[PDB]
Amino acid sequence: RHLKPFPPEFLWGAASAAYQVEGAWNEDGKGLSVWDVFAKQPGRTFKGTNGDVAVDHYHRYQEDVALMAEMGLKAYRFSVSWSRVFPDGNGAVNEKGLDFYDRLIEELRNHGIEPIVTLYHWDVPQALMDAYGAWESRRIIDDFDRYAVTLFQRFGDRVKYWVTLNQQNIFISFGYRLGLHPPGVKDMKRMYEANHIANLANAKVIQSFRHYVPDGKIGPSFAYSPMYPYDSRPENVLAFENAEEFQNHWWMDVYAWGMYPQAAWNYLESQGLEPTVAPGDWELLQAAKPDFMGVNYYQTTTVEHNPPDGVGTSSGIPGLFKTVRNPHVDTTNWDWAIDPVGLRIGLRRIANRYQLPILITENGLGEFDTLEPGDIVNDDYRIDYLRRHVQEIQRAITDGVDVLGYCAWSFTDLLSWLNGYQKRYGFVYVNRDDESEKDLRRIKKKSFYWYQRVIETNGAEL
Amino acid sequence: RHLKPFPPEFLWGAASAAYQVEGAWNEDGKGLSVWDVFAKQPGRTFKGTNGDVAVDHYHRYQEDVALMAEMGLKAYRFSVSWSRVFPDGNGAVNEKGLDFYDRLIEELRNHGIEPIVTLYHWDVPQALMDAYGAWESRRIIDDFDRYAVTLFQRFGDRVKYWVTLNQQNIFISFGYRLGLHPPGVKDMKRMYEANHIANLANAKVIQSFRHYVPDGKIGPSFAYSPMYPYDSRPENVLAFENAEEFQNHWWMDVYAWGMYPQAAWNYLESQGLEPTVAPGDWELLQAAKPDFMGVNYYQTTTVEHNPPDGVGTSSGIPGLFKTVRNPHVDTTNWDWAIDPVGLRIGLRRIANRYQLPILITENGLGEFDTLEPGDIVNDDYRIDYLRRHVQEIQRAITDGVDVLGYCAWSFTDLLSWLNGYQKRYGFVYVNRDDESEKDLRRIKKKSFYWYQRVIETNGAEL
Ligand SMILES: O=P(O)(O)OC[C@H]1O[C@@H](O[C@H]2[C@H](O)[C@@H](O)[C@H](O)O[C@@H]2CO)[C@H](O)[C@@H](O)[C@@H]1O
Ligand SMILES: O=P(O)(O)OC[C@H]1O[C@@H](O)[C@H](O)[C@@H](O)[C@@H]1O
16 A cells, blocks of 8 residues: 655644743733732642743744754644633733744744634633623623734734634633633533534634635644444444534534534533533634634543443443543553544545544643753654654544644643643753743753654655 | 334235246246346256246246235235246237236235235346346347337236336346356456446436336345444444445445446556446436335355455455454354344445435345144244344334334245245245155145235234
């Protein structure tokens, strides 16, 4: 079987998120985000780590882009911090905030790197939470649209690729069901209402994008764990049907088709959990087709039958499914599956169901890297993980999936939302830890040079 | 979770096919079908059994309909023999042939039974095979359309529910890949060409139906074996992705969306097997949406990884998948799997992928039946099989699938295409065998009274 090459304009990328890298949390007129406030609540984050400084990319962006150019990155995906642009979410635009992203975009373009702008990575301005509960109010649809249009107007001439909501399923479920992320709520009814409003906000911004960036490409990015049945027991295959629909189609069908899947809807309706639908909602959701599906991928999930008095280790929904360890894949040191074939499966499923091109917006390995004498980081484990995923992407392309690019997570080490700094993801080590910022110096890991060679050969040497 | 009831207008049905029941193979001007000719080839059918007489429904239809009314059937699904209506396939209409179906439809309507007319059950007139190779020629599109339009014009005022091609995947694959059915060809290239022509014929007649029967409901019926992965090994899940797309989406995506799935298309193209596409084909296929998906269901299929030098007992496609026995399902005395949950899974998959209502056009158990003195046939095994499938349909309805009805296969015993009469499917035993027509008398089996009670309670008592 001859494999197809990676296409000539394949976006070999790397990625970050604003709160995780920028720092400068109160500089240049930036307003408070919900994460600025949440992470300072005692006990919320490991060792009290927060984004006040992070890795200081706000001040060190020129050095970081110089490293990207040394690597030969074709694309860099970053998020814009809404609270830098509209400190209060709505109201007056902050020109100094826009100017940072203008300088970053110019730095990228001057080095031949395609910017991929992510509108939203979980950091809605605290003022919108204070005023109306942020994602629980339809008011956010127009406020988010005004913010997005501002970015489209300022940067649409120079940015072709845009991501709207990044991992909506995570920020909504962690914020409103698990209570782990802002606003720290544990209420499924509120979760599904906020989720519906986020769906409308995504659709509204895509419609606006067609007016302001007619030659651009836009899509949401979904945190996709493809589901597997444990085996060929009919009840386990049925559990897989339930899980793939409830965990995955629930989001991606809205993004692609503007419709929630019916079995999941009817289940929520039987629990009194389905969202409130207003006139015009379906019309808007259906009339906002994206150019691609963004995919954040780390692992698959295997499921089995879960009786109605069952699991609510394993997690699941009684009567629908429960998770079970997959005996046929390796695991990371944090019990995450390592399943590169699962990435090919997920790509195939998206092409098969929606016929959409895919931008892989995030994939990477987190591990406790050691800085050895001479400023050397031997992260062969990260090379092995990335190599295997890139190989499976090439097989998915050969199968016929249109993959637009691959953004490794992450370019530099960064702050995790709740777990501090020690589990590192970067190609570039940042010298700091949970106790202090040290000197924040950037140190290329072995994986940096491996990926440099991948890009130079367009994937022929992995 | 309590099960939902069956909807009040649920079509409790039973079904047959013209060649399998009618007889009267050369009466009232009927022309030869491809099956009249094929079954008379020596050695082709068990003990030389053929459709010359079958169970003589052509002459005994009044008694058979009287039995349906005694059972309280809500619907009877039958096929129309094209060669009775157009003995030469095209050319002159045969009024005596139409008159049989008119008399049958009047008998059904006089007893309050909904006719479900199936346009095609494998019996294209031999004259069209001789003239141009039947399904291998685009000429059949207009000839099939003129036949269908004739039926719509004569019967559309009295028939709401119509099935177009019944089990296209079977008549095409058995006729052109396995050589088991007419025309006895074993050539994948020819199979995919004939299949594409059948797709166009289906779409053309649905378009005609929208004009002639504006209040009717129409759809194709697909012989659906839902695929399962053997286990959660990523390569086996990938084999399942390949198999479901190649075996199932290849047909149902064309019916629902007018498009072949891309990974399967690209594989066939790499083998030189993809069909020839003419201008206008995609437009026609996309503009012929059905009201429902018909489903003929007997069993699921489990698959596993198949290396490129592998199977092509097990069957499959090297590099894509191969079948494997599922250790987690029962079997009939003929080694067909018994998997009622698989029916729920298939119904869920069709709703989840296509949002279509489903008419279950065929499901039943074939087994030897013993005629006991006093005209008693105790077929508790058939009751058990049907009960378990109906129970799973009720669960699919509860999940949110719109199931329009359920046609048990079959109403009376009938002639098998290749295997004679001994493996019986009816609610009504027919006293004949492979060697003799005996007296052709109809004898109600125990399952007849069971289904009568199902219908009386609208499925509440199973
Ligand atoms: O008497 P048999 O051979 O058991 O035939 C029963 C009915 O078979 C249905 O089609 C089956 C077919 O027999 C299988 O070979 C194939 O794999 O499955 C299809 C699935 O529907 C026919 O629909 C019916 O006309 C026969 O009575
Ligand atoms: O450090 P952790 O907890 O493994 O988190 C890693 C990543 O988890 C992903 O879900 C998020 O998209 C990233 O923002 C985050 O960096």
